[PDB]
Amino acid sequence: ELTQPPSASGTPGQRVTISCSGSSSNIGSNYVYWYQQLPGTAPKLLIYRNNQRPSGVPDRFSGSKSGTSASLAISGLRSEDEADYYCAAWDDSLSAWVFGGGTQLDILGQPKAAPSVTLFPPSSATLVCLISDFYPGAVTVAWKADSSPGVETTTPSKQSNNKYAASSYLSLTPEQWKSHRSYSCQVTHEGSTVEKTVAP
């Protein structure tokens, strides 16, 4: 009922525009509302009545409505703007509140960053490899037992500083851990591999 492009991007200090397409029964005859949603946070109302800001919303956000389309504009862009944005409106024909599918805003101009890697042994068996602060958000993970290659590795995901995190886990039996000189977490990012090692 309400269509948004899945993604948008902009550059810090600059502007972005996010569109919302509907019909005469919703956007055409009813007010448009816009929401910001940071990952793992409640949506926050940005715009109501097409073009008004609630108190406490930066005037960097503005809205407009053009026939059966609406647009959210963001100026003075910051890395903290990186979020999902949703349009919403009442639909006279469904008698229902409808939401757009949402637009993921990425903020560009982040330098490439090698991952911070921390390998924990099992406490006095599970091996815990933590991979943090990397950009962009792809990592290849590989495990070694001594020198030779139960692995469960999380999909990468966005941190609050807009860099990326992932964790890889290795389940072993206590006897498996004891019968090796070492175990290794090897983390490949942009063709650059760092190995961390722990020893029984």
């Binding site: 409640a42 609630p54 108190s55 406490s123 815990v128 933590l130 999380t154 995190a165 964790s167």
Partner: protein
């Protein structure tokens, strides 16, 4: 707003949630399945006028009682399809000198599953390893807030989650009523 109710609900059973609110003129419930968009569930107007998502309308009950500072949602005959973070939402609008006020609950993850709730075992990493729990979520504080990094949970082949937090860790697993220091 403050939201509450079970984070685990069995298939075919009824999801129940409450939000505390003091006032407002429109009250509603919105959900978001993991990694998906927002989906309106229903609204009640100060007039009593009530509207539900048609794809759900047979299963939804919403109620508001402003004298008891509450509004509630029930959703019967749930399936895995109803697994989502549920938000309650209250419209205030132009109140005093303040404009366009709309308050949102923090969001409550409700997992529809016939699997049992299982509390975590906590192991020392520095950090804390929070392993083999169900369902999400687990929260972690230290005593200390700076330099703290809590990672997203892995879903292991066991069907149980584990996560790690890096810098005394205080692990909270509300679905199993477990707090570990």
């Amino acid at each position: 707003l403050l939201e509450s109710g079970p984070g685990l609900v069995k298939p075919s059973e009824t999801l129940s949630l409450t939000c505390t609110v003091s006032g407002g003129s429109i009250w509603g419930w919105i959900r978001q399945p993991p990694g998906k968009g927002l989906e309106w569930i229903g609204s009640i107007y100060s007039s009593g006028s009530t509207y539900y998502n048609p794809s759900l309308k047979s299963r939804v009950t919403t109620s508001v009682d402003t004298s008891k500072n509450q509004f509630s949602l029930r959703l019967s005959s749930v399936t895995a399809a109803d697994t989502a973070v549920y938000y309650c939402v209250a419209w205030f609008g132009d109140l005093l000198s303040l404009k366009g006020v709309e308050l949102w609950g923090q969001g409550t993850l409700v997992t529809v599953s016939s699997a049992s709730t299982k509390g975590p075992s906590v192991f020392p990493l520095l950090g804390c390893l929070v392993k083999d729990y169900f369902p999400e979520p687990v929260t972690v504080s230290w005593n200390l807030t700076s330099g703290v990094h809590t990672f997203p949970a892995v879903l292991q082949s066991s069907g149980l989650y584990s996560l790690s937090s890096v810098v005394t860790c205080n692990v909270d697993h509300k679905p199993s009523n477990t707090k570990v220091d």
